[PDB]
């Protein structure tokens, strides 16, 4: 066991191993607070997240377990990963706090797109890295479900990592089937989000800046058109099908006119991501092979993930049992090779 030390940062107590020095508050990001720090063992700048109230309710205890299980499984250059996870507790009896450690990332995609316009070459590289991480995530049967610019961490090398995967105006990046509350949406919802992000990087403008869920769907249908007969056959909900058919029909717009002046390969890919029928949307693996990424695509360096057991999601357990399971996962953590 290492030696811990205690301090207060922004009305919050931080107790960390002495290997982490020079903690500076970076902001209350996520179900937790984040501090930048200097890792004396490696010489690298790290981000340390302290979870808030991790075992206060069954909801929190399960979510804490879910996030730790998820972060421990991900080992990919374009997905946020765990350098370390620790607790100051010496036993389960006094186990009450969980701290997570990853490499410090300088900014998010929202900070970049707002502060500067991006050339087509940067768009290629950024979207390529999103899709490469997504191929990995999806191969483990994990859906992100909330991809957006602020969940994409980026540093000055333009290296990118996906944050907050698999966890839990209205969402401008959410797939339309979600706005319609379809309960059997699948991993292609993330491809829709990537299309919206890509469009924004190319134009500098939010593609679908809806004011609420109804307006969000309206804006979407204005660009991609109202559902065709093939898609209508797949809608079981009677209220939804009746609503969709009651709308005045909208034609699909030509993306080459909407994104005039963009690389026509970029436009072709957007067409393939922003398809209304989720069954016809391009997958992450397929998108990586698209000619738009010809200068980065390497089929021998686009790996998939090990199998990921999500069976715990269907279990009904006590707080103390979720806490014990989380404790087990803290103690069994093995840091990645230096
Ligand atoms: C709109 N917000 C979108 C979310 C965002 C954010 C940044 C960070 C973050 C990540 C990396 N380098 C700086 C900040 C984190 C975060 C921090 C530490 C971690 C340690 C282990 C595992 C995961 C971790 C996630 N989590 N969330 C804040 C802004
Ligand atoms: F997600 C949904 C669910 C139901 C509806 C709906 N069905 N019939 C009428 C509506 C409707 C129309 C306008 N604003 C809200 C709801 C619209 C969207
Ligand atoms: F208006 C729309 C917009 C999107 C969809 C849709 N796209 N992919 C899957 C669906 C879908 C939506 C609701 N129920 C089943 C399937 C269906 C109707």
Tokens of 165: 């995967």
Contact 161, 144 (CB under 8 A): no
C-alpha count within 13 angstroms, C-beta hemisphere, residue 53 = 7
What is the spatial distance between Cα 52 and Cα 29, in angstroms, rounded to a whole number? 11
Q: What angle do CA 5, 24, 156 make, to 5 degrees?
A: 130
**DSSP codes of every residue in 248-301:** PP-PPPPHHHHTTTS-HHHHHHHHHHS-SSGGGSPPHHHHHTSGGGTTT--GGG
Distance CA 318, CA 96 (A): 15
Q: Report the distance separating Cα 199 and Cα 312, nearest Å.
A: 37
* Ligand 3 within 6 A of CB of 36: no
* Contacts for 105 with CB less than 8 Å, ≥ 6 apart: 47, 80, 153, 154, 155, 161
Contact criterion met (CB below 8 Å) for 88 and 30: no
Distance CA 230, CA 227 (A): 8
Residues 6+ apart with CB under 8 A from 26: 34, 35, 36, 47
Task: Spell out the residues 6+ positions from residue 238 whose beta carbon is closer than 8 angstroms to its own.
Answer: none
Q: What is the C-alpha separation between 288 and 46, in angstroms, rounded?
A: 30
CA distance 95 to 88: 8
Tally of CA atoms within 13 A in the half-sphere of 156 that contains its CB? 0
Query: How remote is the CA of residue 243 from the centroid of ligand 2, in Å?
Result: 6
Identify which ligand lies nearest to the alpha carbon of 147: 1
Q: Is 45 helix (H, G, I), strand (E, B) or coil?
A: strand
CB atoms within 10 A of CB 133: 23
Contact present, 51 and 64 (Cβ < 8 Å): yes
**At CA 281, angle to CA 276 and CA 286, rounded to 5?**
165
Q: Is the CB of 240 under 6 A from ligand 3?
A: yes
Burial class (CB in 10 A: 0-12, 13-18, 19+), 219: middle
Q: Residue 89: in which H helix or E strand, if any?
A: none
What are the angstrom distances between the C-alpha of 210 and each of 123, 128, 174, 184, 310? 24, 27, 11, 23, 33
**190 belongs to the catalytic site:** no
User: Is the distance from CB of 50 to CB of 101 less than 8 angstroms?
Assistant: no
Distance 163 CA to ligand 1 centre (A): 7
Please name which of 12, 38, 34, 158 lies closest in space to residue 99, comparing C-alpha atoms: 34
Q: Determine the Cα–Cα distance for residues 338 and 328; give it in Å rounded to an integer.
A: 23
| The pair of three-digit structure tokens given for residue 295, joined into one six-digit string | 């200068």
Measured in whole angstroms, the distance separating CA 220 from the mean position of its chain's CA atoms is: 21
Nearest 10 degrees: Cα torsion 275, 196, 293, 138? -70
Place of tokens 């056959």: 233
Kindly state if the Cβ of 247 falls inside 6 Å of ligand 2.
no
Distance from C-alpha of 38 to C-alpha of 20, rounded to nearest angstrom: 6
What whole-number distance in Å separates Cα of residue 51 and Cα of residue 153? 19
Question: Catalytic pick from 157, 164, 298, 306?
Answer: 164
Experimental method: X-ray
**Burial group, residue 43, by CB count within 10 angstroms (0-12, 13-18, 19+):** exposed
For residue 46, the CA-to-ligand 1 centroid distance in Å is 10
Domains, the chain, ranges and CATH?
14-106 (3.30.200.20), 107-304 (1.10.510.10)
Q: Report residue 248: phi and psi, to 5°.
A: -70, 135
Retrieve residue 228's tokens.
């065709």
Instruction: Establish whether residue 16 lines the binding site of ligand 1, counting it when its CB lies within 6 angstroms of any ligand atom.
Output: no
């Amino acid at each position: 066991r290492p030696t811990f030390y205690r301090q207060e940062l922004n009305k919050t107590i931080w107790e960390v191993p002495e290997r982490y020095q020079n903690l500076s508050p970076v902001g209350s990001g996520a179900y937790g607070s984040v501090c930048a720090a200097f890792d004396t063992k490696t010489g690298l700048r790290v981000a340390v997240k302290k979870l808030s109230r991790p075992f206060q309710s069954i909801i929190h205890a399960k979510r804490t377990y879910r996030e730790l299980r998820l972060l421990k499984h991900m080992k990919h250059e374009n997905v946020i990963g765990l350098l370390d996870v620790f607790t100051p507790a010496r036993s389960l009896e006094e186990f009450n706090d969980v701290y997570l450690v990853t490499h410090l990332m300088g900014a998010d995609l929202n900070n970049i797109v707002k502060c500067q316009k991006l050339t087509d070459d940067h768009v290629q590289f950024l979207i390529y890295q999103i899709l490469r991480g997504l191929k990995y995530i999806h191969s483990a049967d994990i859906i992100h479900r909330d991809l957006k610019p602020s969940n994409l961490a980026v540093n000055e090398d333009c290296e990118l990592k996906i944050l907050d995967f698999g966890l839990a105006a209205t969402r401008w990046y959410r797939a339309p089937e979600i706005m319609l509350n379809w309960m059997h949406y699948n991993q292609t919802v993330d491809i829709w989000s990537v299309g919206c992000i890509m469009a924004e990087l190319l134009t500098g403008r939010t593609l679908f800046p809806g004011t609420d869920h109804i307006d969000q769907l309206k804006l979407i249908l204005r660009l991609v058109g109202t559902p065709g007969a093939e898609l209508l056959k797949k809608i079981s909900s009677e209220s939804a099908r009746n609503y969709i058919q009651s709308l005045t029909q909208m034609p699909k717009m030509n993306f080459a006119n909407v994104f005039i002046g963009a690389n026509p390969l970029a436009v072709d890919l957007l067409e393939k991501m922003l398809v209304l029928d989720s069954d016809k949307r391009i997958t992450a693996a397929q998108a990586l092979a698209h000619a738009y990424f010809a200068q980065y695509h390497d089929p021998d360096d686009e790996p998939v993930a090990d199998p990921y057991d999500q069976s715990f999601e269907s279990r009904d357990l006590l707080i103390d049992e979720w806490k014990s399971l989380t404790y087990d996962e803290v103690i069994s953590f093995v840091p990645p090779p230096l």
